[PDB]
């Protein structure tokens, strides 16, 4: 868009490529699970004992 107040003069409007630009979209990332499900995983344990 080109907005200009007061009378303006234009000519020779060019658009032209230069190069490529890298980028990144959306991934399945590192699943650092929690600090809670750890203590919910060990909620069920058993102690092996030598008599």
């Amino acid at each position: 868009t080109l907005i200009g107040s007061g009378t303006t003069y234009l000519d020779n409007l060019s658009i032209t490529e230069l190069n490529s630009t890298p980028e990144i979209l959306d991934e399945p990332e590192v699943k650092i699970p929690t600090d809670q499900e750890i203590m919910d995983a060990h909620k069920i344990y058993f102690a092996d004992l030598n008599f």
């Binding site: 058993f46 102690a47 004992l49 008599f51």
Partner: protein, 51 residues
């Protein structure tokens, strides 16, 4: 117990000291009441000692 170390009881000695050989040989029967395995805190007999 093999599947879980819980140590169910089997019997009960009473150690003879030098100063109590008169009192223990004086007691004939023994009345017992304990926490059972699947029942509750039932009472179980008064049977004689076994020495």
């Amino acid at each position: 117990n093999p599947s879980t170390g819980n140590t169910y009881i089997n019997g009960m000695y009473f150690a003879p000291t030098q100063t109590n050989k008169e009192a223990l040989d004086y007691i004939q029967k023994y009345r017992v009441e304990a926490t059972l395995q699947y029942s509750g805190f039932k009472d179980i007999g008064t049977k004689d000692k076994e020495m």
